[PDB]
Every structure is written in structure tokens, then in C-alpha cells.
RNA sequence: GGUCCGGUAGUUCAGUUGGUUAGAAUGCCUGCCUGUCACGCAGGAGGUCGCGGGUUCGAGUCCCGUCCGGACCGCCA
RNA sequence: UGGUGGCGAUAGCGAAGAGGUCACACCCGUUCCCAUACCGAACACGGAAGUUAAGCUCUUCAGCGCCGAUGGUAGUCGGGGGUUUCCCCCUGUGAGAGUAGGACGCCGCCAA
RNA sequence: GGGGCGGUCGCCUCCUAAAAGGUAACGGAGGCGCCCAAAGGUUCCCUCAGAAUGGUUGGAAAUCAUUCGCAGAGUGUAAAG
RNA sequence: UCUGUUCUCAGUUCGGAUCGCAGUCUGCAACUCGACUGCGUGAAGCUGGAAUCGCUAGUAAUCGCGGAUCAGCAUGCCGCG
């Protein structure tokens, strides 16, 4: 919200001038911020996913969906039909409300921090985070936490190449 | 001794031979080649013997090309048995060679020695042959 | 295993339909709604 | 950018799916709908000869409203196309949603046609 | 909490703060003495200003996120300098200098 | 949204120990972040002022 | 030449059926015991399943072929 | 220019370039209809801030894909020979991977 | 392709099969003696397998995000359509 | 040892091993190869299988204190309470 208004006011004009897009609305934009959860279950502990779901709901703004595994694999003893992982999508005002928490408090609150992954990009503007702890905002009832597994986080943009997204994330406020 | 490392079936019809070869009728990789002017079968032992008769004589002169593969197996019932009651086991691989097919080709070697060496090897094959060279 | 069964009804005793079923999957006495001929309408058919 | 398929492109597949089952013959023509962002179109089509019979639209040259695309416009255009069928009266048609979902302005149009008396 | 890590919430302050990798008993007692925190209090009941003004002091000393990496690059220096001390570190045998014949079991 | 399943989400003010204020919405209502983006060492542009960092390889016997 | 069996720790046999776990004696190793050895008492490691191919989420244990041996038959003039 | 049909992709895929007052489409926000096995991108909902960027519509091209007889042959119906697992002659018949080239659209009906 | 012994005896898929159908052999390859209260009926909506790249616990593969991708994937099971 | 304050049963304020940093002493000399000290660190260990040892009261069990060896080097030995 705050960020978004700022996105309308300062970010889009600045980088539109910096790249010379003839059409203004061609400017890159964050499309979605999506969360994935994965629990080594195959089932290892049936309560693991049944805990991760309603901790991730607090972490995000709304309930996730339990991911239905695609195909069976005996390497992990993962039979097809035993649920693993959970997903929640975020967009609209919610994605900016989420990025707000992240950039302002979460990354600086990591057990240790330096500049985020230098070349985590995929190649076409998408970009991913691997954060190991659930310490995202400090008011989680953090004493509840038994397992320490953090989040897999993907930010998806309308960028067509890595350079523009790299530049955009700067004034969005991500360190590198 | 060219084994096909695998095959879809280990038994199939003997088939028939009619007309010229479908492809590979002229030299394509070597300076000179050898051609067969009637239809017949050709087996691992034949190609192996001819190959050795070629290369061991030619020594360091160059390289020899083989355009043949005995993908076809052929069966034979066990010795001393009444015929019938199931196709016999397979014990050899064979390559169909219609007339016009060029079998072997030589590269990087003088003309006369290739001529006489191909003549030498031809006696290993059971088939009337004709010397042939690239256009 | 699949075992034969004949269907029955409470609206009227006369019932005729047959079917197959798995004991493991349906241990309970199953119900279907079907057209009884002699009652000349649709009714709820149990099994015997 | 993220490969977003055209909305009309997605709609065309559904429209072809539904069209596969039915079409409007002589004395049993087919109604059709376009649910454009800014306008609503209606058409009475005879498949076999490949020509329309009568049509109606929000941007028709009379009876306009500031809606021109909302449910009120759908009702008005529906009764309009009902009259446009009436003068060369057909009295029956096979409905065919334009690969849409029968809940909204399409329902308003269908209700208008029915109450006007085009027996589906 | 105190510096990127937790602390037990129901222990005396002097002992409890020692849990962060980088300060032991003596360092903790001297720094809490400099702070004036009474040297004995369950960390549950303490005030916000005193918390904050004990944060900055320990931040201006090196703590786990930096000492861990620094000790590692120090042993790295010993490793690739080619020292005898370095190769003992590499192989995992005692480095301070001990008779490896009999005990030597604290390592390996 | 399907009413009820999601937790109550609402405006949630943010207060850091430095006093920095931020206009957030959250499942919660008030959060006490100890250190914020305006304070954390790497986050201070480049260690502007939240720092204690010196590094040398030295060799000095002159006393 | 045909039909049927099997092939597992270094040796001998279970499992080999339970498709989703490799086990029991002996041997071997360390220690104790004895003056020494042997018994004996504590502990411990092992094979990853004759070979190759295939089905299956998963093969030791299912189906094929190859090697190995073992059982039976190979008769009428 | 939109809508909606028939035609074998000679209509496709690519590479470039033009358009938008109107039409279309992106867009704006979920207030109530409806919905996201999580969500207003998607479903629907009610507007019209700005944009031809994309879609869509037009101009160009043989790079790919596609279509394509002419004479050849291989095969082959029916006759006739031969030293006959296979070859050859005569009346026809006629392969396809190859080029001659066609093509980067043609026909409609309702609304401009 | 004498008997005995061995093997087989019904049904389903393909090739042998000679561009309709049919067509044998102790000819060449497989399967069936079920299963499914939904794996049926209907309305409505989409779209695959594999690969590359980023992502931790987590690799060759678990679960994510982008792109390519006429069908390689699926279709209860054995082959063909 | 006695007195008093805290700790409240944990691999813990037990245990202190091993480690990097910074020093002191002696000796020409402390890398192989001393001891001691300030930091940081904090390991295994939560009463030890089969077996086995010393001890008849100032003994065993604990607690320290000296001394030969000699610049420094003692958990050993000798002796004392």
C-alpha cells in the first residue's frame, strides 16, 4: 500500500525514463508473490503438514492449500496420495502488505544477514528466496515453533529480462 | 562378429529378395568400393573375415568403411530332430545384400593396392563382385 | 471379491433388480432409487 | 511478460465446445451473444445457409441507455431482438451462449427473450 | 532476541546472556555492570530502555555472526599457509601439541 | 474471500526501537521489531552508522 | 536331448511366501578368565541376495533368458 | 472496422513494419449478483482514469512447415521366354522421398 | 509329421494374411476366468510427458515459479483402433 | 571445614576436554617441543558389561602442605599434617 502508492508515484516514472519504453504501461510490474511449503513427510509425521498449514496461515494473510503430490516415488517412500507441502498465493493489496513486512523487518531480523543472493534470477525476471527460519515478523507466537524449516518464496514480475527486474528490485528495496 | 546389441524379436521370417538394392548403390565415403551383382545372405563370419583380410593387409595405409549390418537373425532347429513342433533357436546373424549394394569402401590409399586387396577380400564373400569407384 | 446381490424395497416386497458389489468397499446394506415396474413409479430399493 | 492468454482466445475454445453439440437450422435458428467489455450483441443465425436473420446490440440507433453494457441494457436488447424476430416471426430458437457462463447479462438477455415470447 | 538469537526467559540475566556465542561469565558480568542491570533478574521482567541501551554496547563488540566467520577464516589462513599447525588442523590431529600415541581422542 | 476460513486481517501499526513508524496491515495489530531497515548494519545503505568493524593483518614488535 | 528343482555372511541353513525389514548357528575380531593354551564369559563386523533383462511406488522373494549344479525320463520294434 | 460460418495449413510457424476518435482489447475497484479444493489474473460484477505495449487488424518475405503433373524409373494386371530362391521381352498401368513452381489466405451474411 | 513321454484343449489382441471379408500348421508375440458405488449418467471448467533455469530441509528425482513443448503422457488391465 | 546469599534438577551456573585470539615467565632458543594466565569457546560424561583391586581405626576415604630431581618442566615419587 505504502509501497504501492510509491510504486505509482516515483518508481514507474523513474525506470520508465531510465529504459525509454514508448508505451508507459509497458513498465515492469510485480504480478504475484507466492509461497510454497514442503515437509519431508512421505509420511514421516502426519501432524507435520497439519502444523505447517496453520502456521503458514499466520505467516501469510490467508489460508494455504495442501499440495497434492504428482507421482509416486519409492526413493523417499512417497506414495502417490499422501499429502506433502502447502501453497498460498498472494496478490493485490496483500502482496504489497507482505513485501512491506519482508523488506522492513524480516530480512534484517534473520539470525545473520548479508546482501541477498546475487544471481538468484531465473533469466526472465522471476526471482526466488530460500529463507531457513520462520522468524518473518516478530509477533508470531514464536515459542510454539518446533520445527525450524523456513519458507520457499517466489516473486513473479512482468519483466521480460533479468536486467530490468534487477534494477526494479533496487528501488523496491531489496538489498543485494 | 557384429552383434546387434538388442532386437525387438529374436525370430522372424526369412523373407525374399527382389530387385536392386534400395540404397547405398555407389561409393559414398571412400575413394573406391566393391559391389555385389547378385542377391544373397551375408553373415558375421563373412564380414569379419573380409574385414580382417582387408585391414591386416592394408596396415597403416588408411581406413576401411563397412556398409552392412546383420540386423536379421536366422534360426536353425537343433541337430537330429524331427522337423516341426516350434521354430528352432537362433544361432547366427545375417545381412541381406541385394545386387547393386556396395559393401566395403577404402579411403586414403593408392589405387592399385586397393584394387588387388579388394580382389583378395572378395574371395572371402560367396558372391560375384565388381570393382567400382567414386565418380 | 464381487458378490451378486438382489435389490429389495420397503414400498413393496416384489423386487427383481440384481447387481454386483464389493464387500470391502460397501459392507453396509446398500440403497438405490430405481423404477419398480409393479408399483409403476420410482421408489427406494434396498437389498435383501 | 508472463504468458497471459487472450480472454477472447480462451472464450473461443468454450464457444467451439458448446457449438459442437448444436446449431440453428431453418425454422429452428440459433441465438448468439457477445459479452464485450463495453457492449452486448445478439444475433439470430441460420447455420445451414450461413446467414443471419436479425440482430440487436446495445449501440443500436435508438432506445439507448447510459448503461450500454449492463444488465438493464441486456434486458432491453433482449426484448428488442425478440421484436426483430417477431416481424419475420419465428417463434422458436435454440439458445447458444457465446461460450459464457449462464449467470449474468446473458441470463438477463435470455429472460428478456423468454418474456417477450421467443420459445426456446 | 539479544543479537539474532534467543535467550531463556526465566534465568538470571548474567548467566542467561552468556548463551550468545561470544560472551562468557566474565564478559557478561562486566558488561551488565557497565549497564547497571542489577546483575540478577529473570529476563522476563526488565525495561525497554535498559534493553535498548544494552543492545548497542554488545553490538559494538563482535558477536556470533562475526566471530564464527572470523575464527573460520583464521583457521583457513592456517590451512593454506602450509603450516605444520595448519596441516595438523587439516588432518584433525591435536594442534596445541600433545602425545598423539595414547589418548588423542578428543578429536577424531 | 470465502468468509471465515482466513484469519482476521487488519491495519497493524509498526514501532521499532529507534522509533521508526510504518503503515502496515497484519493478522496482528501492533508489532515491536527490535531493529528495522533504517537501522540494521548492512541495511544502512553501507554501514552508515550502525557498525563496529575493523580488519587488519598486522605485525608490530616495537615497544 | 527333454521335464522339475534350486543357487543367499568366509562355511551351513532360514527369509526365499508376507513385493514395502536381509536373519540363525559356526567362523572371525576385541576384552575378561588361565602361569600359557583350550573350554567358558562379555561384547562386535559382515553379506546387500548366481548373472543379465523386464513389470512396479517399490523386487531378495514377480516374469523372462544365460551360467551353475542336483532329481527324473530317454521306451516298442 | 466488429460479429458470426464454409473451405484440406495454398489458411500454419517465424522474421520485420504500421493502427485505435469509433470497434476491440488491455485497464479501474469488488458495493451487491457469482468465485477463487488459497486469490477479483479466472470466473462474474459495474465503469471508462490512460494505452496501442500486448491481443486484434493490415503491409512485406520462401527461413521452417504446407501444396504440387509433366518424362523417368521400382512395382504390377495379362501374355511369352530363361541357364528359374531369381531374372528377361511385349499391350497397358502406374511408385515416392526430386526438382517446374503455388502459397506467408479465398468465399460469404448482420453491424460501419 | 508312427505311437509313448513332453505340450495343448474355452475366450480376447496383433502378425503370419497375398491393400474387401475369410483363410492352416505342435507358426511368431501377449493376455482373460476380473475390477469400478464410483474408475458409471449428466452439467460445467481445463490440458499433457519430458527438458532448461532459480528455489533449503532436498539429491537425479518430493513440493514451488518462468519458458519450451501435436502428444513423447494418459486412457482400470493385454495388443490394436 | 563453619556461617550467610543465589541457583532449583537440566547434559544444567555440573564437567571442563579440544580449539582461535592476546599475554607473563625462564632460558641464546618455547614450530617439532614447556608451564602459567585473560578472553572467546565449551566436547564426552548423567555411575560404567564379563571381570577385578586396596584397606582391620588415626587405617580406608577425602583435604591440602612441603621436598629430591633443578633456570622451566610433576595428575609421578618421597614425606608431612
Automatic annotation (TrEMBL), chain A:
<comment type="function">
    <text>This is 1 of the proteins that bind and probably mediate the attachment of the 5S RNA into the large ribosomal subunit, where it forms part of the central protuberance. In the 70S ribosome it contacts protein S13 of the 30S subunit (bridge B1b), connecting the 2 subunits; this bridge is implicated in subunit movement. Contacts the P site tRNA; the 5S rRNA and some of its associated proteins might help stabilize positioning of ribosome-bound tRNAs.</text>
</comment>
<dbReference type="GO" id="GO:0000049">
    <property type="term" value="F:tRNA binding"/>
</dbReference>
<comment type="subunit">
    <text>Part of the 50S ribosomal subunit; part of the 5S rRNA/L5/L18/L25 subcomplex. Contacts the 5S rRNA and the P site tRNA. Forms a bridge to the 30S subunit in the 70S ribosome.</text>
</comment>
<dbReference type="GO" id="GO:0019843">
    <property type="term" value="F:rRNA binding"/>
</dbReference>
<dbReference type="GO" id="GO:1990904">
    <property type="term" value="C:ribonucleoprotein complex"/>
</dbReference>
<comment type="similarity">
    <text>Belongs to the universal ribosomal protein uL5 family.</text>
</comment>
<keyword id="KW-0687">Ribonucleoprotein</keyword>
<dbReference type="GO" id="GO:0006412">
    <property type="term" value="P:translation"/>
</dbReference>
<comment type="function">
    <text>This is one of the proteins that bind and probably mediate the attachment of the 5S RNA into the large ribosomal subunit, where it forms part of the central protuberance. In the 70S ribosome it contacts protein S13 of the 30S subunit (bridge B1b), connecting the 2 subunits; this bridge is implicated in subunit movement. Contacts the P site tRNA; the 5S rRNA and some of its associated proteins might help stabilize positioning of ribosome-bound tRNAs.</text>
</comment>
<keyword id="KW-0699">rRNA-binding</keyword>
<dbReference type="InterPro" id="IPR002132">
    <property type="entry name" value="Ribosomal_uL5"/>
</dbReference>
<dbReference type="InterPro" id="IPR031309">
    <property type="entry name" value="Ribosomal_uL5_C"/>
</dbReference>
Automatic annotation (TrEMBL), chain B:
<dbReference type="GO" id="GO:0006412">
    <property type="term" value="P:translation"/>
</dbReference>
<dbReference type="Pfam" id="PF00252">
    <property type="entry name" value="Ribosomal_L16"/>
</dbReference>
<dbReference type="InterPro" id="IPR000114">
    <property type="entry name" value="Ribosomal_uL16_bact-type"/>
</dbReference>
<dbReference type="GO" id="GO:0003735">
    <property type="term" value="F:structural constituent of ribosome"/>
</dbReference>
<comment type="subunit">
    <text>Part of the 50S ribosomal subunit.</text>
</comment>
<comment type="function">
    <text>Binds 23S rRNA and is also seen to make contacts with the A and possibly P site tRNAs.</text>
</comment>
<dbReference type="InterPro" id="IPR020798">
    <property type="entry name" value="Ribosomal_uL16_CS"/>
</dbReference>
<protein>
    <recommendedName>
        <fullName>Large ribosomal subunit protein uL16</fullName>
    </recommendedName>
</protein>
<dbReference type="GO" id="GO:0000049">
    <property type="term" value="F:tRNA binding"/>
</dbReference>
<dbReference type="InterPro" id="IPR036920">
    <property type="entry name" value="Ribosomal_uL16_sf"/>
</dbReference>
<keyword id="KW-0687">Ribonucleoprotein</keyword>
<dbReference type="InterPro" id="IPR016180">
    <property type="entry name" value="Ribosomal_uL16_dom"/>
</dbReference>
From TrEMBL, chain D:
<keyword id="KW-0699">rRNA-binding</keyword>
<dbReference type="GO" id="GO:0022625">
    <property type="term" value="C:cytosolic large ribosomal subunit"/>
</dbReference>
<dbReference type="GO" id="GO:0008097">
    <property type="term" value="F:5S rRNA binding"/>
</dbReference>
<dbReference type="GO" id="GO:0006412">
    <property type="term" value="P:translation"/>
</dbReference>
<keyword id="KW-0689">Ribosomal protein</keyword>
<dbReference type="InterPro" id="IPR057268">
    <property type="entry name" value="Ribosomal_L18"/>
</dbReference>
<comment type="similarity">
    <text>Belongs to the universal ribosomal protein uL18 family.</text>
</comment>
<dbReference type="InterPro" id="IPR005484">
    <property type="entry name" value="Ribosomal_uL18_bac/plant/anim"/>
</dbReference>
<keyword id="KW-0687">Ribonucleoprotein</keyword>
<dbReference type="InterPro" id="IPR004389">
    <property type="entry name" value="Ribosomal_uL18_bac-type"/>
</dbReference>
<dbReference type="GO" id="GO:0003735">
    <property type="term" value="F:structural constituent of ribosome"/>
</dbReference>
<keyword id="KW-0694">RNA-binding</keyword>
Automatic annotation (TrEMBL), chain E:
<dbReference type="GO" id="GO:0005829">
    <property type="term" value="C:cytosol"/>
</dbReference>
<feature type="region of interest" description="Disordered">
    <location>
        <begin position="91"/>
        <end position="108"/>
    </location>
</feature>
<dbReference type="InterPro" id="IPR010979">
    <property type="entry name" value="Ribosomal_uS13-like_H2TH"/>
</dbReference>
<comment type="function">
    <text>Located at the top of the head of the 30S subunit, it contacts several helices of the 16S rRNA. In the 70S ribosome it contacts the 23S rRNA (bridge B1a) and protein L5 of the 50S subunit (bridge B1b), connecting the 2 subunits; these bridges are implicated in subunit movement. Contacts the tRNAs in the A and P-sites.</text>
</comment>
<keyword id="KW-0689">Ribosomal protein</keyword>
<dbReference type="Pfam" id="PF00416">
    <property type="entry name" value="Ribosomal_S13"/>
</dbReference>
<dbReference type="InterPro" id="IPR027437">
    <property type="entry name" value="Rbsml_uS13_C"/>
</dbReference>
<dbReference type="InterPro" id="IPR018269">
    <property type="entry name" value="Ribosomal_uS13_CS"/>
</dbReference>
<comment type="subunit">
    <text>Part of the 30S ribosomal subunit. Forms a loose heterodimer with protein S19. Forms two bridges to the 50S subunit in the 70S ribosome.</text>
</comment>
<keyword id="KW-0820">tRNA-binding</keyword>
<dbReference type="GO" id="GO:0000049">
    <property type="term" value="F:tRNA binding"/>
</dbReference>
<comment type="similarity">
    <text>Belongs to the universal ribosomal protein uS13 family.</text>
</comment>
Amino acid at each position: 500500500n505504502r509501497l504501492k502508492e510509491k510504486y505509482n508515484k516515483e518508481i514507474a516514472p523513474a525506470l520508465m525514463t531510465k529504459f525509454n519504453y514508448d508505451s508507459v504501461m509497458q513498465v515492469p510490474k510485480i504480478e504475484k508473490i507466492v509461497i510454497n511449503m514442503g515437509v519431508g513427510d512421505a509420511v514421516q509425521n502426519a501432524k507435520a503438514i497439519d502444523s505447517a498449514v496453520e502456521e503458514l496461515t499466520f505467516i501469510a494473510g490467508q489460508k494455504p492449500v495442501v499440495t497434492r503430490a504428482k507421482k509416486s516415488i519409492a526413493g523417499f517412500r512417497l506414495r502417490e496420495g499422501m499429502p506433502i507441502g502447502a501453497k498460498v498465493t498472494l496478490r493485490g493489496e496483500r502482496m504489497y502488505d507482505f513485501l512491506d513486512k519482508l523488506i522492513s523487518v524480516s530480512l534484517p531480523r534473520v539470525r545473520d544477514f548479508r546482501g541477498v543472493s546475487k544471481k538468484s534470477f531465473d533469466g526472465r525476471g522471476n526471482y526466488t528466496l530460500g529463507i531457513k527460519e520462520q522468524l518473518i515478523f516478530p509477533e508470531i507466537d514464536y515459542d510454539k515453533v518446533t520445527k525450524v524449516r523456513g519458507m520457499d518464496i517466489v516473486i513473479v514480475t512482468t519483466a521480460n529480462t533479468d536486467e530490468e527486474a534487477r534494477e526494479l528490485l533496487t528501488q523496491v528495496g531489496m538489498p543485494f | 562378429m557384429l552383434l546387434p546389441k538388442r532386437v525387438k524379436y529374436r525370430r522372424e521370417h526369412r523373407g525374399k529378395m527382389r530387385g536392386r538394392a534400395k540404397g547405398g548403390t555407389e561409393v559414398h565415403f571412400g575413394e573406391f568400393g566393391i559391389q555385389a551383382l547378385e542377391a544373397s545372405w551375408i553373415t558375421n563370419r563373412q564380414i569379419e573375415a573380409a574385414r580382417i583380410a582387408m585391414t591386416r593387409y592394408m596396415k597403416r595405409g588408411g581406413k576401411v568403411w563397412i556398409k552392412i549390418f546383420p540386423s536379421k537373425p536366422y534360426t536353425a532347429k537343433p541337430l537330429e530332430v524331427r522337423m516341426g513342433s516350434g521354430k528352432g533357436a537362433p544361432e547366427g546373424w545375417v545381412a541381406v545384400v541385394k545386387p547393386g549394394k556396395v559393401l566395403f569402401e577404402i579411403s586414403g590409399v593408392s589405387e592399385e593396392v586397393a584394387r588387388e586387396a579388394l580382389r583378395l577380400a572378395s574371395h572371402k564373400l560367396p558372391i560375384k563382385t565388381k570393382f567400382v569407384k567414386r565418380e | 471379491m464381487r458378490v451378486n446381490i438382489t435389490l429389495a424395497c420397503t414400498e413393496c416386497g416384489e423386487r427383481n433388480y440384481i447387481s454386483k458389489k464389493n464387500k470391502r468397499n460397501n459392507p453396509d446394506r446398500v440403497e438405490f432409487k430405481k423404477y419398480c415396474p409393479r408399483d409403476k413409479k420410482s421408489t427406494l430399493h434396498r437389498e435383501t | 511478460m508472463i504468458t497471459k492468454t487472450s480472454k477472447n482466445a480462451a472464450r473461443l475454445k468454450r464457444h467451439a465446445r458448446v457449438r459442437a453439440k448444436l446449431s440453428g437450422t431453418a425454422e429452428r435458428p440459433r441465438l448468439n451473444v457477445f459479452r464485450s467489455n463495453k457492449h452486448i450483441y445478439a444475433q439470430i443465425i441460420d447455420d445451414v445457409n450461413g446467414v443471419t436473420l436479425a440482430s440487436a446490440s446495445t449501440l443500436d440507433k435508438d432506445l439507448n441507455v447510459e448503461s450500454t453494457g449492463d444488465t438493464s441494457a441486456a434486458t432491453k436488447v433482449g426484448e428488442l431482438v425478440a421484436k426483430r424476430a417477431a416481424e419475420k416471426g419465428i417463434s422458436d430458437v435454440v439458445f447458444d451462449r457465446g461460450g459464457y457462463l449462464y449467470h449474468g447479462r446473458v441470463k438477463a438477455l435470455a429472460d428478456a427473450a423468454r418474456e417477450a415470447g421467443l420459445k426456446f | 532476541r539479544i543479537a539474532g538469537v534467543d535467550i531463556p526467559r526465566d534465568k538470571r540475566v548474567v548467566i542467561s546472556l552468556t548463551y550468545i556465542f561470544g560472551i562468557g561469565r566474565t564478559t557478561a558480568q562486566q558488561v551488565l555492570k557497565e549497564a547497571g542491570v542489577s546483575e540478577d533478574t529473570r529476563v522476563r521482567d526488565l525495561t525497554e530502555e535498559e534493553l535498548g541501551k544494552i543492545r548497542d554496547i554488545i553490538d559494538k563488540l563482535k558477536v556470533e555472526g562475526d566471530l564464527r566467520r572470523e575464527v573460520s577464516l583464521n583457521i583457513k589462513r592456517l590451512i593454506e599457509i602450509g603450516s605444520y599447525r595448519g596441516i595438523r588442523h587439516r588432518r584433525g590431529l591435536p594442534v596445541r601439541g600433545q602425545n598423539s600415541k595414547n589418548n588423542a581422542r578428543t578429536r577424531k | 474471500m470465502k468468509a471465515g476460513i482466513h484469519p482476521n486481517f487488519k491495519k497493524a501499526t509498526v514501532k521499532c526501537a529507534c522509533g521508526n513508524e510504518f503503515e502496515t496491515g497484519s493478522v496482528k495489530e501492533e508489532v515491536r521489531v527490535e531493529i528495522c531497515s533504517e537501522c540494521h548494519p548492512f541495511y544502512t545503505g553501507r554501514q552508515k552508522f550502525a557498525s563496529a568493524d575493523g580488519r587488519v593483518d598486522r605485525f608490530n614488535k616495537k615497544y
